[PDB]
Amino acid sequence: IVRSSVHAKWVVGKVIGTAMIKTAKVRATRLVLDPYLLKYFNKRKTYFAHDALQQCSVGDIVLLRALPVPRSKHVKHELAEIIFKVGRVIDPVTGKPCAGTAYLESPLSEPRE
């Protein structure tokens, strides 16, 4: 069960497109230090990921796992998890639905629905 060669064993990014069959185009960003300014800026990379169930929507944050064997020229990752669904975020700290900086369901309540 040897792991991939690619350095990016785990990459987080935003689903910027979903028009290919069973594939999601994901834009990841990393911080790179400008040598002259000594300030960090965003260098963004595009990753094709295998979305087996076509469960991804544009704008949602996702976690990708490096595939052991490249599926195709560009598809070298799979969809591990959908960290945040677009507009359907669930607060990790409390576990309650939220819509921005607000709770759709109060954490004091226990709906269990």
Partner 1 sequence: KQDDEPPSSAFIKEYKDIIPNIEKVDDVVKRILSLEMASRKEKLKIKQEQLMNKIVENPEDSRTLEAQIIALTVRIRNYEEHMQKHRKDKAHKRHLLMSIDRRKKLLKILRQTNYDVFEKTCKELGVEYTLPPLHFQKVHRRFLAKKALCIRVYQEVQKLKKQKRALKAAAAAAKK
Contact region for RNA (CB under 7 A) — 19-27, 54-62, 85-93, 104-112? 19-27
Q: Is 8 in the site for RNA (CB under 7 A)?
A: yes
For residues 24 and 49, the answer to whether their CB atoms sit within 8 Å is yes
Q: Report in angstroms how near the CB of residue 70 gets to RNA at its nearest.
A: 7
Query: Residue 77, class by beta-carbon neighbours within 10 Å (0-12 exposed, 13-18 middle, 19+ buried)?
Result: buried
Q: Is 87 in the site for partner 1 (CB under 8 A)?
A: yes
Catalog residues that contact partner 1 under the rule CB under 8 A.
16-17, 58-59, 85-88, 99-100, 104
